[PDB]
Amino acid sequence: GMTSRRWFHPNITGVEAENLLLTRGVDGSFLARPSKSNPGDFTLSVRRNGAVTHIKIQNTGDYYDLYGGEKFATLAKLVQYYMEHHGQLKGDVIELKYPLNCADPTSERWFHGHLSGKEAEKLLTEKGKHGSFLVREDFVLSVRTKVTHVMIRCKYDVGGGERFDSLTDLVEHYKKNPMLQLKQPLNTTRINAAEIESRVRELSKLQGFWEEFETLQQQECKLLYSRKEGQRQENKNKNRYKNILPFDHTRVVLHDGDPNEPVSDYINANIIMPKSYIATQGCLQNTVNDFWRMVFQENSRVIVMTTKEVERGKSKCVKYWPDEYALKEYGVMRVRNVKESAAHDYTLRELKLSKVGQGNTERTVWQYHFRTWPDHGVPSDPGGVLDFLEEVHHKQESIMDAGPVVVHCSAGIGRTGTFIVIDILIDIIREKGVDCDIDVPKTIQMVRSQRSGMVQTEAQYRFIYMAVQHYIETL
């Protein structure tokens, strides 16, 4: 009974609130709405013994109060507390029993929110077809056959005829008896952080997640950038798969290599910029020296390993780090394993990297080896991955001038993309909280333009949503 603001009515008045509660509601019903008493503050309208009371909710920027009593980080938390505790007093007691859900479009797939008539016509032509429709903010029920914008007055009707209780009912009733014929919706992928729980329910019902991923897969044609360095005879033995190559414009360029070697400037790795990252593949025996040259050169102090060296009988990454207490040389680079510490889902190895011939070059590189990801599929609970990502974030924040975080699996696209995309999104939520707009496929596309095919499966696609929703819940 958390996260969602369904009982929140953003555009109603005190008189409308009383009317809704007295007609549509019952004793113990309630809704929240913005305060007319103070901008930014909220007012809670509740039905008690046949009449409606209005309670002031203080919003200080740091917390939410009822001008005294317990404090909460979000409005939904304040509401859940009072719904489950019943310590809402004046000295009269008020009970928060049944939320009165807002009938206006909110977290709806077909609802594009704030979007101009020209912007909707630009969207219904570039990505839309015949019968295709979108609802924008009164409400414009824009259709396409050329785009015809059917207006709607708020009871809700499209000029005349039938008055439906909610727009979710009026969008399904105008598709059966066409006024213009409605066939399929344009659909949005943007979702407000606080409403992810609702959207995840929509995408789970018969399929939303499949639709979203397939659509995203269809847009890879627009990301057919040059991979010329990756596709060369001199670099053919440096790639795990001949089809998974770095883009030339984003690739990590290596310097001062072995002159005997034909090409020394190459590694299957790309810089990812939303704090930057290096999405790289698992080490091949022949690329171990290159990986460390790159770690040194880029000033990275954190490595995120998301694969076991051996998974389902196959070599996914070669062991590129020395054993506990030991030291090893990897070409020009020396690595010393100082300490290995273990947690439930991962192991942290504290490594000391330096150029051979100079101790004045030594820096600590922290390797966060995630060991519990399944051979095939995604983890049941996103908690572990989130606790891991929080550990990696604090380490990166705690270090001065630390370079990009090197993230890798085998190919450097599947789990690498999943980890980087989850980290990018939860960072938007860290800086803006529950009141921010997040677009999972817009973010994936943005990362895909930097390294090809980041986030390989639909399982992974759903897992990003599952981790981001779970992150929101804990706030």
Numbering used by the authors: 0 to 89, 93 to 139, 146 to 153, 166 to 174, 178 to 202, 210 to 236, 245 to 312, 325 to 525
What do the study authors state?
The non-receptor protein tyrosine phosphatase SHP2, encoded by the PTPN11 proto-oncogene, is required for normal development and functions downstream of growth factor, cytokine, and adhesion receptors. SHP2 contains two tandem SH2 domains (N-SH2 and C-SH2), a catalytic protein tyrosine phosphatase (PTP) domain, and a C-terminal tail that has at least two phosphorylation sites. Normally, the binding of tyrosine-phosphorylated ligands to the SHP2 tandem SH2 domains is required to overcome autoinhibition, but oncogenic mutations of SHP2 destabilize the autoinhibited conformation and lead to enhanced basal activity in the absence of tyrosine-phosphorylated ligand stimulation. Allosteric modulators that stabilize the closed form of SHP2 have been recently reported. This class of allosteric inhibitors was designed to stabilize the autoinhibited state of the enzyme by acting as a molecular glue between the N-SH2 domain and the catalytic domain.
To investigate how the most frequently observed SHP2 oncogenic mutation, E76K, affects the structure of SHP2, we resolved the X-ray structure of near full-length SHP2E76K (1–525) to 2.6 Å. We found that, in comparison with the basal conformation of SHP2WT, the C-SH2 domain of SHP2E76K undergoes a 120-degree rotation with respect to the adjacent PTP domain, which fully exposes the PTP active site and repositions the N-SH2 domain onto a PTP domain surface opposite the catalytic pocket. The swiveling of the C-SH2 domain thus acts as a pivot to move the N-SH2 domain across the entire body of the PTP domain from one side to the other in switching from closed to open conformations. In both the basal SHP2WT and open SHP2E76K structures, the phosphotyrosyl binding site of each SH2 domain remains accessible to solvent. Nevertheless, there are interdomain contacts between the N-SH2 domain and the PTP domain that create a remarkably different N-SH2•PTP interdomain interaction surface in SHP2E76K from the N-SH2•PTP interface observed in the autoinhibited conformation of SHP2WT. The buried surface area of the N-SH2 domain decreases from 1025 Å2 in SHP2WT to 357 Å in E76K, with no overlapping contact residues. Specific interactions include a salt-bridge between R4 of the N-SH2 domain and D485 of the PTP domain, and hydrophobic contacts between T73 and V484. Key residues that stabilize the position of the C-SH2 domain with respect to the PTP domain in the open-state structure of E76K lie in the segment preceding the C-SH2 domain core, and in the linker between the C-SH2 domain and the PTP domain. The open state of SHP2E76K involves a 120-degree pivot of the C-SH2 domain, relocalization of the N-SH2 domain to an alternative PTP domain interaction surface, and full exposure of the phosphatase active site. Likewise, the X-ray structure of SHP2E76K fits the SHP2E76K SAXS envelope particularly well (NSD 0.99, Chi 0.77).
